[PDB]
Backbone:
């Protein structure tokens, strides 16, 4: 019976629109606070969702932690610009503690980071994070942006994830990307959808560190204007079907 | 206790935010979890009855009749059907009639009832003349045969007029309802058109206030809750002739419903660039 309480908590999270998810969980623990069996079930479920979806967790003023597979370290999460691993609570979405590998990779990682921030800063400027992660050996660039119409009403989530792995170390590179976008209508929060665009582009670079970053950042800017074009024709298409189905509601014969 | 109030806050929040088409499923899941608790069974019943009243829900009555649930029909804990002269006891979770208490009929109706009867007849005629019938919900230029079981619409329509008397001032509430179903039981839309006039017999001018609510609730196989509303407030010239009074009110309703048709037929999709961030993806010209 206590087992049946678990399956429906999942269903509660399944279809709910994104802007509303935070609220419900907050109360779900308070609802089931004495049941440690479903409390551990909840801690498990939220960490996955939060990791699956690149949740932004704010730290101090003007920083963000990105919760995902790629930043996970043990059960903590890496912020590469600072040299810090963070312990977080997934339910509340806040940081609760902080405790701080080729030498050359780091400065390729950095240069991508700095031109990444410059790009987001001019054109994205609402929650907006950008970070570059480095790891048989590739670099990961990431822009996250959550827009709200007002207060807590979700307008969009933009997740743009880019990985490049090097055999040809200095002359030609492979850059793969995924842009995941979630949008909810202000007119109706039950009208919402997710779309995903994949890219696999080859880029020319030199032994120059920053041209390596600038060339990659030139590709992202263009791939992102591309997805955007697709999206604005998907919105208008949907909006237009909404109008068409709404006019079918009029019960009068149509003159 | 503290939890009882937090369980309520949660039940309220989920039923508040749920689109109409998920409410029933949502309630059922709430009962399995909290079903032994008669306080929250009753809390849920209260919340749903008010919800039902807020949405001019239709409950089928006998063959081909409907009770309409809303403030204006409320009588005690019952609901009036003004033409049959029946108070209906309803189950709000089940959306069914569970008892009826007939009113004693009057050999002679007083004058208010004569206004109500006249407004009732013109309201029904109006729907008859101007609302789509079966061949008009057809997806064709012309009325043809509907092909296959699944293909087609089920449409449920109801209208009613209610009368009350507040300190010798009269009041009439006129109401039209249509609900469209895809397949047979997927609720697609509601149309709710509601009209009040508060007036004296001697008045030659009345104020007719109205509200027209259009809600799309099925869209690309999802339950949604896309609402459009237009409110109206019209001065109408009338006389002591009761039937002409009904015709004048009905002429304004005819025009206001035409005005919404025009509005809906001139909505377009916004093609601004900031669409993702744009509060208005649907706009008029
Ligand atoms: Br939202
Ligand atoms: Br950042
Ligand atoms: Br954006
Ligand atoms: Br909404
Ligand atoms: Br209709
Ligand atoms: Br409450
Ligand atoms: Br309970
Ligand atoms: Br019955
Ligand atoms: Br009556
Ligand atoms: Br009636
Ligand atoms: Br029941
Ligand atoms: Br009866
Ligand atoms: Br009577
Ligand atoms: Br008449
Ligand atoms: Br009826
Ligand atoms: Br009718
Ligand atoms: Br549809
Ligand atoms: Br759905
Ligand atoms: Br309004
Ligand atoms: Br008006
Ligand atoms: Br108007
Ligand atoms: Br007169
Ligand atoms: Br008369
Ligand atoms: Br008019
Ligand atoms: Br028109």
Residues:
């Amino acid at each position: 019976l206590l087992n049946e309480k678990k399956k429906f908590i999942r269903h509660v999270l399944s279809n709910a629109p994104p802007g509303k998810v935070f609220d419900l969980i907050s109360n779900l623990k308070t609802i089931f606070g004495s049941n440690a069996i479903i409390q551990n079930f909840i801690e498990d479920i939220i960490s996955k969702y939060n990791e699956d979806n690149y949740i932004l967790i704010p730290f101090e003023s003007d920083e963000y932690i990105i919760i995902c597979k790629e930043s996970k370290s043990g059960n903590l999460y890496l912020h590469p610009n600072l040299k810090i691993l963070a312990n977080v609570n997934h339910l509340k979405r806040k940081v609760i503690d902080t405790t701080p590998h080729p030498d050359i990779l780091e400065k390729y990682r950095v240069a991508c980071n700095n031109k990444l921030k410059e790009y987001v800063d001019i054109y994205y400027k609402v929650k907006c994070a950008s970070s570059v992660y480095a790891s048989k050996y590739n670099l990961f660039l990431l822009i996250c942006c959550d827009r709200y119409y007002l207060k807590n009403f979700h307008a969009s989530s933009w997740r743009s994830s880019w990985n490049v792995n090097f055999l040809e170390a200095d002359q030609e590179i492979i850059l793969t990307g995924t842009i995941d976008v979630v949008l909810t209508y202000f007119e109706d929060a039950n009208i919402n959808f997710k779309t995903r665009k994949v890219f696999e582009k080859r880029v020319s670079v030199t032994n120059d560190i920053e041209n390596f970053a600038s060339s990659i950042l030139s590709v992202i800017r263009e791939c992102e204007n591309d997805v955007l074009y697709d999206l604005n024709h998907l919105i208008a298409n949907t909006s237009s079907d909404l109008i068409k189905n709404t006019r079918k509601i009029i019960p009068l014969n149509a003159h």
Observations:
- The domain at 103-243 of chain A is CATH 3.90.1150.210 (Aspartate Aminotransferase, domain 1).
- The CA atoms of residues 52 and 152 of chain A lie 21 Å apart.
